[model samples]
Target chain A: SLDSISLIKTPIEAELEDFKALFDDSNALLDSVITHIRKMMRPILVLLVARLYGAVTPATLHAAVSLELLHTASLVHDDVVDSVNAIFNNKVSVLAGDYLLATSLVHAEQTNNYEIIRLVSSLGQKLAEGELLQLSNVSNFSEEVYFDVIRKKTAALFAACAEAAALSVQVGEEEVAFARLLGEYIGICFQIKDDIFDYFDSTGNDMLEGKLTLPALYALNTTKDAWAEQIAFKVKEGTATPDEIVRLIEFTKDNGGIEYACRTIEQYKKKAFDLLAALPDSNICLALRTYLDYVVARE
Target chain B: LDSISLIKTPIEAELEDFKALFDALLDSVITHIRKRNMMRPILVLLVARLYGAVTPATLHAAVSLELLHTASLVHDDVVAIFNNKVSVLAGDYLLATSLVHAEQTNNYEIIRLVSSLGQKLAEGELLQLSNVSNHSFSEEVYFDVIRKKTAALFAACAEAAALSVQVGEEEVAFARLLGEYIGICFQIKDDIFDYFDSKGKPTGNDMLEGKLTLPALYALNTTDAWAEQIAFKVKEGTATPDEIVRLIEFTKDNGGIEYACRTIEQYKKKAFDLLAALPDSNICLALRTYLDYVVAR
Candidate 1:
């Protein structure tokens, strides 16, 4: 498993620097909230994708900044939506998220690329839809619904990085579309791996908070475990005790959910490379492979 | 044939067209969130009418501005109504729908207006959030919040309409100023509404949310220590229902309601004078009625 992201950034470190600097804004209140989430993965993907096409242009810089801004905005609102067990003022969380979202839109417009703007707008719309779907389907336990949830939630954002970054460098069509598909494949691995890690934690709060992921779904379907059904129902109904949830985590692991989740992640990571490894050879191709490995193999 | 008796004059046809388009754009399953006579869109058509003929583009601008207004209001739910695992993404749908129409206008200037208005709306909400716990109270803090929060939305509606019609730069500039003044008055009128009853019912929702608007602010300034001391309690979200019940009565008895009404009339005069500068075309006169309704209604 790859633990280093520095190698992933090795190909586009300068472009990533350009991205971080440009994405910076200096309002004290906004600064206060944003400082903690000055993150790397999504915008790094954006910059790397931009560099694959060439040097990150002014348009690409704006696209990278906007994508991160939009993602950061989603994180703030997500915290507020799941405002349970959080250290935030709900009022501040909501407004701060609004501020970030609006700023993201401005950055998209600054690019003057209509497609990038539409991409950013729909990224927002799709993210909202994804959360709405998650909220609506929290109780339903099906592999299709589970995949659909992550597809729109996490995969959609990863796809956006490539599509919008390529759209920015359109100085470009099929390659942009191809990059988007590659993005979703890799992103699925990212989210699935993240979910798999939850099962390893003794107290997996995802189920406690009404989340049912791919691994648990696979295990539930593959094994007709009788008690697992009632307890799983208890988790969804949000009534599972800590001991029960801890036991549920043990049950899922015992039932091969973790192994199934691991293999499913590998399935995506491979398909991602199938498309990515086909790209023209360069330092970027290696960096992308490292990047996908970093995402799916971080644990 | 529709909900027309109030804003039935002049752009009634345009007004009629706007409702359906905006309704379709704002469709969502979240039903608890929902409008006024839609002063923002009215300002769009009315302003467009002053300088040029209202076309499909004009109506689209109206729809977009109204969509933005609805989006801001829906987003505002997070500050309060969204307390129920409340739909953060719900408002997001409206904003994207808003962007869709702003794009439809094919005018980057309107898009700029729409985006900036969105930023300003959020900033204003942030300002209000900060001010709710602000230790001090005065006209300055009160006006700052409302002008940014309420004023900018109405200002965008008129300017979007003006810019849509290819109006001269001077006309567009004046239209924004006109919109801001009227918008400012609209909010002050709204603030005063909390002090008094509605058409027949009582009003205290703002106080419950830990806000001390102009009427209460004015009355607090007048009292020795009783008003000055407890007013902060209202903002600190500590005031009891009993405390608020009297605060309204005290604000009323101290003439805060009358003072607030006079203040809005002063804004109305400033706005009426701006309208006086324009031609007294029927649309322009209706703009007068619109401003009047903002304070009058």
Candidate 2:
């Protein structure tokens, strides 16, 4: 009954406008960048947190916009970490990412909340640590390490946003902690769902690219097939063929890798919902549940 | 009492401390270069010392400045060299550490100033990118890029230093002007290196990289086609060594080099004028030495 969609979308759209006006688009692929950002769930995460707490003031909008910018900045840098062909392309991407990050702090400062400022500041450290952890573990991929990376890289911002929302309204400490739990569990679920998508998508190359995610890990661990381990190892070593990759993908799916991932996703989703249950019953809580369902059930 | 050595020890000590903090956070991937200046921090310390406000806050401001500078360079190399994924992450890591360190100051103004510097740094790069693509070789564009790219940080360095000391706004503004001119002079002198042949070495890579510096911009206007053709080839990544050599000579012969040197002197003079406004003390003398080295060398 509460026009929840517009409530969340309004601040996001306003922030996007401010972004366009502040940054000159000619030097950067700003339009393409914005299109990609519009598809992400981070902005919604910000709005949900803010709405759950209370009224969405300019400070709340600023916090949400800044959080989204931080995520976008990391994505730009992620592209650079993955590809390095041109000086101009890499240079522009790096600067664009830095601009977003810097802009994030600038906006967070406008909120006049020192705690929010500190929260946004720590996200940079956490995200970089996550990226570095992933890079360092290229030779060795364990579920434990994978969770750590995702938590730092992905969940840190989510927790920060949720906690920031609670802080924005001076909510109790218990509620802030609960909000972080809700955000973090949702983040973990989001990543698992993403992993599952890699298997079902026709163009998915996760197995071939050697990215060890939940589905791949479960598929390998659950099925004690020696051949499957060999193929996965080869893929990690960058020596696997197209045919080998295809077989490996089929092997994992046949052995319940995707199913295992679905169960794990459901588990995290439940934990997140349970946290939501603890919160006071309100329109925001209902809306958050809807968003959580969309995250796990998407595609 | 000279006290110059006393002042230098704390500045140098804090620089080492900053390096230690960087190493602990980023796991020591960037110390090999050491090209990132402590000068910004040094200027900050020197200015703070001038006001007799040499405190930990000033050191924190200086450390943040150096971290931001180092972070930008780490990323700058990713563009200069192909396939440097580690450098990319290293750059990101440094920026994160920079924020962590900047927050230690606990001054909202300082935090905001350091944070805003990131935007200015990116904007500077983007402005230069547009200028390079559009072939907009006006003096204003060149100075504007340098101001944003280099001078802004330098200004931040001096201003942050002054702000840490809780100096009057007039003094803070003056410190920023001093840094801005020094930064402009520093970059202009660097651009001059492109024209000269170093021990019969090839033309500077800046030309081959298709970066049209102030001297090259001046040459492009005077020797129009001669420079433009080679520049396009370089930008297209098809220029030969011989073409680069010829381009270097043309830049020299066409008076671009001379014009750039004259401009550098003007900036040096302006920087000196700002210094004159500052009190004549041991720290100011040290600052003068630093500025002289930046412009003269």
- Among the numbered candidates, top TM-score falls to 1
On residues A1-299, what C-alpha lDDT tens digit does candidate 1 reach at each position?
65466667777777777777898723346556655455477777777777787778888888878888888888877777653334347656776777788888888888888888888887787777656665555335787877887788788888998898888888348879987998889788888888888887435879888777877887789886888887888888878888888887887888888888888888888898888766787777778888887777688
- Clash pairs detected, candidate 2: none
Model 1, C-alpha of A91: deviation from truth (Å): 1.9
Best by DockQ: 2
lDDT of 2 by residue, B227-252 (tens): 68787776655788788777777877
Angstrom error of the Cα, residue B277, model 2: value is: 2.8
Query: What residue pairs are clashing in model 1?
Result: none
True lDDT of residue A133, candidate 1: 61
lDDT of each: 0.77, 0.73
Highest lDDT against the true fold, candidate: 1
A198-267: candidate 2 lDDT, tens digit per residue: 7765445776666767877887777767898888788888788878877877787788878888998898
Q: How much is A220 displaced in model 1, in angstroms?
A: 3.1
